[PDB]
Nucleic acid binder design. Structure first.
Lengths: 217, 452
DNA sequence: GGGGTTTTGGGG
DNA sequence: GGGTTTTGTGG
DNA sequence: GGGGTTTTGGGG
């Protein structure tokens, strides 16, 4: 029924629309009011159910450091922030190194403008969990991959190259190598499947460490 | 020399280090609290403290340490723990035993059953009935006088678990009432299925006495003892209100999944009372997209105990690994990405027994010649798809589709049922559980059949 | 006081 | 102690 | 020597 988590609904719609942020519901592109769980070494914000890592543009931080002097970003822990201008992009990453992702795929929350509300901002919430560790969301990403995999295989595999029945019907004096059953899923370059149709968004972003040096050498 | 005292007889006044043997009936997983502190909370019982007048009564034990490795991992309820230098105090009416493992306290776990959990998983035999399967510090010593204590406590443990539920109705919440809880709660349910979501995670399909079904993520490394058809107690779960497509329980780093010793009356009754549910699967088959996994097949009873082999090992190591080379029959799980030949009508061909050749069923001895292209969790990220055959000319897998071979060009009934099965098999979140026989470098499905 | 350790008597 | 770390997919 | 723990300086 109704999805309580704003992030879960947002990210799920992004994946169900092939990473196209223009296809996601417009009634969801409103300002995001979220609590800051962590600020360093990882900046993580919650929506009352899950936590995601926001990616600030160099413009977003400069605009911040101007309208809100001395109020450091790497110290916003346990305080709320309001993201007025943001966008969502899909990126190919190494999940073994990025915990805010899954299956080498990540949905990024690009932040263009955000304001802090230190006004004793509260909200009794359940313990926030990594959206990319959620059962349903992981499944959504698996659906996404399965769809891309199936489309690539049905385009790559053709001619019905069936194993000759004789090779397995008279296997008394016949020996074979199991790797003969391996079939390429697509026209790739390496050992990883990468035949996706969504255009990987770019957009430059700041490393959480640079914003720490910019405020405290 | 150590003097062991019984739980109910331990001194609350003398804040001196005491030692005891006890049966563990509950425990959190060892968890970190800050940068230098780890903790494990458990409930313990013995001949003098085991039953409130009906509900199970118990003492508590809190172990403090500076390292994760210095705390006991309780995978099973009913095993025995031995503690040295514990301080007893009253905490909100209950007898609480505290032990700072990081200082001078120590613990040792003894298996109540023949083998410990880990020993059961790795099919190992216990060194002896007097050897701890786990303990703190570099060494553990058991004196001759301790043997009788251990042997008598085991006998008592089995009597206790076989004649009492031990985990009484006041220690867990019915799954169909989970949504009414304000916070976390406990659960007692049967594992109906263990689905390998990915490289590091299992998805448990649970069903308790209330008949409700719930899913929950279980890390492979953390809970390697989860097995289908077994009953477990889950310590600390929460209802996921963000899950709309299916009922999900959320676990925390301190949450724990505990099985029961063989003599457990509770586990025995639940194992028999709680029967498999396929309602979730049947309903999902009406949707274009199912966030719930559906295992479409069932393997012959005689293979139920056979361990599974991943596609990674089957196709990439089967010709190099010693263990895999000595085996010709394997059990594996996978999902079908594509089925060949494309035209379902050509799935059945005519076979000539003498020339070992098959032809379009525009002529021959009817058999199935289907080639599935599959993939699984172990090969999820690679750029491969694997061939798994269903060549029934010799009888292997003849009843897989629950449709006997026939000219699909003429028999409309058979063609339709096979076409419907095709769509189901290639559908997202559909999986196959099957046994295969290796022949001339290929794997042929056998003793496996669809259940939908 | 008592561990493990080496400090082998003596700090915080 | 019926709890909340990162080792951020045992902790 | 250094922890935890009180023994608060000193055993083996």
């Amino acid at each position: 029924p109704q999805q309580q988590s704003a992030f879960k609904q947002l990210y799920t719609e992004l994946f169900n629309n092939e990473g196209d942020f223009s296809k996601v519901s417009s009634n969801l592109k409103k300002p995001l009011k979220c609590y800051v769980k962590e600020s360093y070494p990882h900046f993580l914000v919650t929506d009352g159910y899950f936590f995601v890592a926001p990616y600030f543009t160099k413009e977003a931080v400069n605009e911040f450091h101007a309208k809100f002097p001395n109020v450091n970003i790497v110290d916003l822990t346990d305080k709320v922030i309001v993201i007025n201008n943001w966008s969502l992009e899909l990126r190919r990453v190494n999940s073994a190194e990025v915990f805010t992702s899954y299956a080498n795929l990540e949905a990024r929350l690009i932040v263009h403008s955000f304001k802090p509300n230190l006004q004793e901002r509260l909200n009794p919430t359940r313990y926030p969990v990594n959206l990319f560790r959620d059962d349903e969301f992981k499944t959504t990403i698996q659906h996404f991959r399965h769809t891309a995999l199936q489309a690539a295989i049905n385009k790559t595999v053709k001619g019905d190259n069936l194993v000759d029945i004789s090779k397995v019907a008279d296997a008394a004096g016949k020996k074979g190598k199991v790797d003969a059953g391996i079939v390429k899923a697509s026209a790739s370059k390496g050992d990883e499947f990468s035949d996706f149709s969504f255009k990987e968004g770019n957009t430059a972003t700041l490393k959480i460490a640079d914003i720490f040096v910019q405020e405290k050498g | 020399k150590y003097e062991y005292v019984e739980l109910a007889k331990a001194s609350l006044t003398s804040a001196q280090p005491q030692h005891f043997y006890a049966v563990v009936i509950d425990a959190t997983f060892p968890y970190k609290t800050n940068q230098e502190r780890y903790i494990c909370s458990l409930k313990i019982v013995d001949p003098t403290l085991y039953l409130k007048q009906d509900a199970s009564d118990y003492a508590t034990l809190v172990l403090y340490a500076k390292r994760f490795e210095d705390l006991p991992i309780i995978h099973r309820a009913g095993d025995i723990i031995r503690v040295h230098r514990a301080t007893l105090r009253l905490y909100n009416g209950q007898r609480q035993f505290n032990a700072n493992v990081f200082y001078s306290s120590s613990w040792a776990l003894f298996s109540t059953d023949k083998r410990s959990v880990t020993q059961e998983i790795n099919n190992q035999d216990a060194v002896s009935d007097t050897t701890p399967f786990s303990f703190s510090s570099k060494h553990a010593t058991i004196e001759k006088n301790e043997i009788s204590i251990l042997q008598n406590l085991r006998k008592w443990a089995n009597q206790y678990f076989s004649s009492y539920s031990v985990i009484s109705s006041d220690m867990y919440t019915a799954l169909n009432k989970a949504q009414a809880q304000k916070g976390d709660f406990d659960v007692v349910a049967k594992i109906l299925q263990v689905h390998e979501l990915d490289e590091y995670t299992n998805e448990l399909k649970l069903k308790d006495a209330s008949g409700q079904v719930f899913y929950t993520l279980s890390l492979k490394l953390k809970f390697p003892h989860v097995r289908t058809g077994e009953v477990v107690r889950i310590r600390s779960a929460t209802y996921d209100e963000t899950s709309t497509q299916k009922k999900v329980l959320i676990l925390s780093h301190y949450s724990n999944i505990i099985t029961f010793i063989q003599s457990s009356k509770l586990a025995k009754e639940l194992r028999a009372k709680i029967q498999d549910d396929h309602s979730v699967e049947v309903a999902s088959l009406k949707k274009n997209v199912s966030l719930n996994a559906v295992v479409l097949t069932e393997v012959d009873k005689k293979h139920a105990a056979l361990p599974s082999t991943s596609l990674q090992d089957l196709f990439h190591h089967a010709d190099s690994d010693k263990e895999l080379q000595a085996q010709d029959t394997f059990r594996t799980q996978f999902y079908v990405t594509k089925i060949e030949p494309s035209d379902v009508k050509e799935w059945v061909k005519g076979y000539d027994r003498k020339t070992k050749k098959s032809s379009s069923l525009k002529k021959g001895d009817n058999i199935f010649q289907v080639q599935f292209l599959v993939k699984d969790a172990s090969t999820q990220l690679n750029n491969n798809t694997y061939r798994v055959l269903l060549y029934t000319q010799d009888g292997l897998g003849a009843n897989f589709f629950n449709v006997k071979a026939d000219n699909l060009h003429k028999n409309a009934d058979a063609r339709k049922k096979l076409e419907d099965s095709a769509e189901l098999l290639t559908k997202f979140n559909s999986y196959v559980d099957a046994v295969v026989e290796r022949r001339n470098g290929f794997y042929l499905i056998k003793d496996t059949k669809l259940i939908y």
